[PDB]
């Protein structure tokens, strides 16, 4: 077992849609998940959670720092030092909300002409690109009604080919009934990203 310390940013889903958000400092690789102490950078009281195995045996413990949305969004730099008897010198991890952010360019693409001729299902494609950091949300609406997650597929945020600064992209395909598309009702891809002015943006499409 080889103790490792990693600190995790607040989930974008919580920042933009939750009423709470937390940073999570995890210490993985523990043969005996006892006597782990976390202490950080002077706010609210951080809750440790229970021990837990990781992969290939071994254990791990985490410390969530509740109610961190506002400090995170203000530009605060967090530091988490974890002390344990299975490491020599307590390990440290720093993290702060990112500068050098870029808004996603959001596009929603019509179905391929071939699929329109098939007349069964048609594929709508949403593309968000040019954004950083890679964390992003994608939701779908038909008309003004949000579609359940189970009716579309969102790929992982991946780095773009670029000579220069790093940007990310994400695709999402929603397949709908050809009749719905041809009868003329709208479809919308909604994208959440911390660099957007209103946190969310939307593109809408129809024939």
């Amino acid at each position: 077992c080889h103790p490792r310390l990693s600190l995790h940013r607040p989930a974008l889903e919580d920042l933009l849609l939750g009423s709470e958000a937390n940073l999570t400092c995890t210490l993985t690789g523990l043969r005996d998940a006892s006597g782990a102490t976390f202490t950080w950078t002077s706010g609210k009281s951080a809750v440790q959670g229970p021990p837990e195995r990781d992969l290939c045996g071994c254990y791990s413990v985490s410390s969530v720092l509740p109610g961190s949305a506002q400090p995170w969004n203000h530009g605060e730099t967090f530091t988490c030092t974890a002390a344990h008897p299975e490491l020599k010198t307590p390990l440290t991890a720093t993290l702060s909300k990112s500068g050098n952010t870029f808004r996603p360019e959001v596009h929603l693409l019509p179905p391929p002409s071939e699929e329109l001729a098939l007349n069964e299902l048609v594929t709508l494609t949403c593309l968000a690109r040019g954004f950083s950091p890679k964390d992003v949300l994608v939701r779908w609406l038909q008309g003004s009604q949000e579609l359940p997650r189970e009716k579309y597929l969102t790929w992982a945020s991946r780095q773009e080919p670029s000579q220069g600064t790093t940007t990310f992209f994400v695709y999402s395909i929603l397949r709908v009934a050809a009749e719905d598309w041809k009868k003329g009702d709208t479809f919308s891809c909604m994208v959440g990203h911390e660099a957007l002015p209103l946190a969310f943006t939307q593109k809408t499409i129809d024939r």
């Binding site: 920042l15 933009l16 849609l17 949305a69 506002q70 969004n73 203000h74 909300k97 939701r139 003004s144 949000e146 909604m190 959440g192 911390e194 002015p197 209103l198 946190a199 969310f200 943006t201 939307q202 809408t204």
Partner: protein
Amino acid sequence: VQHLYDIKDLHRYYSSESFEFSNISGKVENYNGSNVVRFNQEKQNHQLFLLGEDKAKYKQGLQGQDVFVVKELIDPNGRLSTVGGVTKKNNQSSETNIHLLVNKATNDSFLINKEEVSLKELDFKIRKQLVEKYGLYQGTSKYGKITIILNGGKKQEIDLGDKLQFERMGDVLNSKDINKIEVTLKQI
């Protein structure tokens, strides 16, 4: 450098419904680093973003102000996101009938209800009239200019090629200070 590919979006936005709410109150909150004010009106949750000088002016929040709202979108939690459009809690009111000259020459008019009006409301209401009676954001009509001419010769201009910039929606004007409005529609 100028195109017609976003015509449907502009037409949808400036033909959509607006709301003029009175006595709105709410405290300021941090949302994604932004200053927002959430309030419920007509059984609908709203999320007002304060992004221009309206950010500095409403540090505490809204304490009974008038708000001109336009749906930017309804977020996954059901909140209507709207930008700017806050004018002061006013104990005085009067009518200003504003002459609106539209050049494509046609005399129109535009009735304002309050003594302090938001540039957002002026922009949105003028454009909606242009969309519904003058063909704006239809076919090849997109570009042009709104010129708000103030008493004394000062002017304030808005380009029709893009939505009003979020940072300008919190700017306000004294209705009495409006002399007239001219619009020029430059079509292809």
